Design a protein around this nucleic acid. Structure first.
Ligand SMILES: [Mg+2]
Ligand SMILES: [Mg+2]
Ligand SMILES: [Mg+2]
Ligand SMILES: [Mg+2]
Ligand SMILES: [Mg+2]
Ligand SMILES: [Mg+2]
Ligand SMILES: [Mg+2]
Ligand SMILES: [Mg+2]
Ligand SMILES: [Mg+2]
Ligand SMILES: [Mg+2]
Ligand SMILES: [Mg+2]
Ligand SMILES: [Mg+2]
Lengths: 129, 70, 88, 224, 170, 74
RNA sequence: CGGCCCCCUGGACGAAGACUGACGCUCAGGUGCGAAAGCGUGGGGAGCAAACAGGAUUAGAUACCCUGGUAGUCCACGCCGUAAACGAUGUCGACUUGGAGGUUGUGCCCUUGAGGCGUGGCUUCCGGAGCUAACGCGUUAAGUCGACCGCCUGGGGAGUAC
RNA sequence: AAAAAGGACGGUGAGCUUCGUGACAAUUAA
């Protein structure tokens, strides 16, 4: 069964990028919208939208630069079988700071830099490079 | 395969008609299969083998119509 | 394999109306009815393992729904088990 | 300057049977009629025009254009087009390595040029029969295939290809050396190696003449 | 410029063709073995010259001629189209037989032999059954005399499922 | 005469969308059993798998009732 | 698992909907099923056929071949729980261009037919990207991932000894 | 009562063993 919607999101992004898809459809959720909202400020995706009320659908517009996938790599860090929690001093650097780590802190979900500026740790959701 | 010779029918052509009727009925082939005994397992392989062979005939009955030889 | 009349009857006394065919109490009662019916069949034909696999499948399914029930609305469960001929 | 009407008459919109299509040709496929694909001309026309411009720009700077077509339906057509614009063409079998092994095929070109000269002067007197007939056949082969490239001299500046799938070998060598490729890509063709994709029919004498005429006009214009 | 959808809708109406339908080709070039014909399709067709030639084998077609040939494919032939004209001639034979059936037109053939219930007759390569007692008005006892002679015939029944043309002179 | 039984290999049964062939019916069935009483393979007769199973089932029932012979040998 | 028929009975799939409202996935130990051979008891016995006997072949022939032939193969009721028990690929879910065939549902359209356009289930063969040591696999993955379990760490000794 | 794309032809072998030990690999570039 489907037990980690976040990993499903990563596969949906990675497969659509590798397949040169213009857009990808998936079941929606607050956390998925929050991650997609975070993705907008760094330019990894073009735009996101939410349709439906009983069964919300999250729609992401993929991005390509020279016919090549914008998302080079994305991989899950904290997983249902193994939760990963990091203190603020130990926060990882994804793609030598060029990429971002989605961190769920006490003040909500933010990037590793946002957590570092705010001095907060949390759960490492994913690596994006 | 019961053949009855008609009037003004030469004997040789009646025999020739008899050869075909037995052949289309596969009498000779059937007896050959049943002369000795075959093992469940082996046969299955032979059948699948012949089936793959006929599938290749289909895949050769087309697509091969291209390229040159001389 | 239950007859149409038997399915229609069982829904009536266990459901609110004729269209409440999906409630957990109806599912357990429908399963229990078939377990009892197949018991006379399964005492004889002892080697009918293929049909016996089906019986254990409904038994397992009945176990999860009854366990699911007891978690919520405990009361409803006790009324169901007393009304039906099941020890547990 | 070619208009949508003229291309429609020539059958450019016609593709191949659905049994042979390549899914990478989906963006340029308008639809399928009677299990035959139809190329979306509304996308070809703007993009075809942009290619024609660049070809004029290349011809403006003394660029060398190499027309590639091997179908017997279009072999003579490509030949005539190149002759008109004093370009180069390969109507006979494409010999592997003209581009990657250019420094070796030059020797065969050199042999061809001497054979063209020394046979007109020499054979007339020193016939002997046998050797004369032998070298004559030799000449045939070479020219029939390499005749259009005897005076080409060096690496080309651009490739024009009909049926990118059939001449995939030529496109590979051009990609290796970084020479731009302009190819007519049908529904069964692979556009991955083509730098300037022209989705159109590659099997019709009518359509091929249209394409060749268009390209020939633009290059002469730049030259002048 | 007009939309592609409307343009292609136009093109198909002046063409009126389909694998089951008939096409109006234009002769392009006449070669020793094949003839190049354009029917508005995606590729020229090199149709063998004998298909255009009449039953006697004389070239009745010249460059630019319009020919009501039959369509075979569009790109089955290595990506090229094939065209048929002997099938169109075969269609001509079948339709004139149909006219002989309905409009009482005459179709000429040859009696090839005698069978249990009548005669086997030849109609331009087709097999026909001619009832023995319905051959002619006069009740001639010895009806064999008409075998092997060219005769007119009228179609009584046409069976495509057996290529059997039941005919009689009556 | 003009005996000619060209078979273009189509489904006679399909025409009429027979919901279930009938064993009782004999004439129809006979047109599909060889002289040696064997069942003709669908490769030669072209019938669909669905109707052949109905056909095979029906002929075997007819065979039991002795309406057609099992074999010509007797 | 393959003649036909009856009685009892399991599962799968599809159409239009309604109902319940996460009730789910996996599973150590545990339990059940589990080809053939074999074992126990009671039947049955044609054909075939371990063992065995004779005749051949060979230097020998405890074999291949020939003529015979017992257990067994069959039935009833128990036991054994092993197989190259193989797709040598554990189960479940999502995602990632296509083509042909087979089988089985179902919707619509001058039903116009020996038609056309869809939409489900299962299955076979070509193969793209990708993956792979390679062979190859390739929407039924051996591709990209997630959940859980079993299991491997040089050959032999040894799947053996206690 | 035909047109190859061929449906398939069964015709068949008696027996004819084993090659001592270690060593032909020998090299590489600036
Ligand atoms: Mg266990
Ligand atoms: Mg046993
Ligand atoms: Mg026993
Ligand atoms: Mg016994
Ligand atoms: Mg002995
Ligand atoms: Mg002994
Ligand atoms: Mg023996
Ligand atoms: Mg084991
Ligand atoms: Mg097995
Ligand atoms: Mg192994
Ligand atoms: Mg493959
Ligand atoms: Mg042991």
């Amino acid at each position: 069964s489907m037990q980690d919607p976040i990993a499903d999101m990563l596969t949906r992004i990675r497969n659509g990028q590798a397949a040169n898809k213009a857009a990808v459809t998936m079941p929606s959720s607050k956390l998925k919208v929050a991650i997609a909202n975070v993705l907008k400020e760094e330019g990894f995706i073009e735009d996101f939208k939410v349709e439906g009320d009983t069964k919300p659908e999250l729609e992401l517009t993929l991005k390509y630069f020279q016919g090549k996938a914008v998302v080079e790599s994305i991989q899950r860090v904290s997983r249902p079988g193994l939760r990963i929690y990091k203190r603020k001093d130990e926060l990882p650097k994804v793609m030598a700071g060029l990429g971002i780590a989605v961190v769920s802190t006490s003040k909500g979900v933010m990037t590793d830099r946002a957590a570092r500026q705010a001095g907060l740790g949390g759960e490492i959701i994913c690596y994006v490079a | 395969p019961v053949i009855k010779v008609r009037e003004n029918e030469p004997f040789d052509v009646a025999l020739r008609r008899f050869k075909r009727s037995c052949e289309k009925a596969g009498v000779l082939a059937e007896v050959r299969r049943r002369e000795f005994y075959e093992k469940p397992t082996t046969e299955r392989k032979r059948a699948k083998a012949s089936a793959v062979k006929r599938h290749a005939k289909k895949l050769a009955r087309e697509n091969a119509r291209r390229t040159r030889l001389y | 394999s239950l007859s149409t009349e038997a399915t229609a009857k069982i829904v009536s006394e266990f459901g609110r109306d004729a269209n409440d065919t999906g409630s957990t109490e109806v599912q357990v009662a429908l399963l229990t009815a078939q377990i009892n019916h197949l018991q006379g069949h399964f005492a004889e034909h002892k080697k009918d393992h293929h049909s016996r696999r089906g019986l254990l499948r409904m038994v397992s399914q009945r176990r999860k729904l009854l366990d699911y029930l007891k978690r919520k609305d405990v009361a409803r469960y006790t009324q169901l088990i007393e009304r039906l001929g099941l020890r547990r | 300057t070619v208009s949508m009407r003229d291309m429609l008459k020539a059958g450019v919109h016609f593709g191949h049977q659905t049994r042979y299509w390549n899914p990478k040709m989906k963006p340029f496929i308008f639809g399928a009629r009677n299990k035959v694909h139809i190329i979306n001309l509304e996308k070809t026309v703007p993009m075809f025009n942009e290619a024609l411009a660049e070809l004029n720009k290349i011809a403006s700077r003394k660029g060398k254009i190499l027309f590639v077509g091997t179908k017997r339906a279009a072999s003579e057509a490509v030949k005539d087009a190149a002759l008109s614009c004093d370009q180069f063409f390969v109507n006979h079998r494409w010999l592997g390595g003209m581009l990657t092994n250019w420094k070796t095929v030059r020797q065969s070109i050199k042999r061809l040029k001497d054979l063209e000269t020394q046979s007109q002067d020499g054979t007339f007197d020193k016939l002997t029969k046998k050797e004369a007939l032998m070298r004559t056949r030799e000449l045939e082969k070479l020219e029939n295939s390499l005749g259009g490239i005897k005076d080409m001299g060096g690496l080309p500046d651009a490739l024009f290809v009909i049926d990118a799938d059939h001449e995939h070998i030529a496109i590979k060598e051009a990609n290796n050396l970084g020479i731009p490729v302009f190819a007519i890509v049908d529904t069964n063709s692979d556009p991955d190696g083509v730098d300037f994709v022209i989705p159109g029919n590659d099997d019709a004498i009518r359509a091929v003449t249209l394409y060749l005429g268009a390209v020939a006009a633009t290059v002469r214009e730049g030259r002048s | 410029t007009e939309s592609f959808a409307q343009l292609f809708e136009e093109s198909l109406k002046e063409i009126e063709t389909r694998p089951g339908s008939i096409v109006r080709g234009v002769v392009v070039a006449i070669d020793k073995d094949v003839v190049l014909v354009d029917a508005g399709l995606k590729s020229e067709s090199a149709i063998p010259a004998e298909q255009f030639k009449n039953a006697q084998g004389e070239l009745e077609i010249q460059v630019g001629d319009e020919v009501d040939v039959a369509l075979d494919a569009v790109e089955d032939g290595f990506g090229e189209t094939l065209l048929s004209r002997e099938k169109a001639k075969r269609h001509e034979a079948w339709i004139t037989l149909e006219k002989a059936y309905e409009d009482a037109e005459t179709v000429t053939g040859v009696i090839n032999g005698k069978v249990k219930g009548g005669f086997t007759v030849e109609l331009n390569g087709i097999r026909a059954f001619l009832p023995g007692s319905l051959v002619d008005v006069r009740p001639v006892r010895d009806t064999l005399h008409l075998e092997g002679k060219e005769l007119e015939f009228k179609v009584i029944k046409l069976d495509q499922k057996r290529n059997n043309v039941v005919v009689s002179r009556r | 005469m003009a005996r000619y039984f060209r078979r273009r290999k189509f489904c006679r049964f399909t025409a009429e969308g027979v919901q279930e062939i009938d064993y009782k019916d004999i004439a129809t069935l006979k047109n599909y059993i060889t002289e040696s009483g064997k069942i003709v393979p669908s490769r030669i007769t072209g019938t669909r798998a669905k109707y052949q199973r109905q056909l095979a089932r029906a002929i075997k029932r007819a065979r039991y009732l002795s309406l057609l012979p099992y074999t010509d040998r007797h």
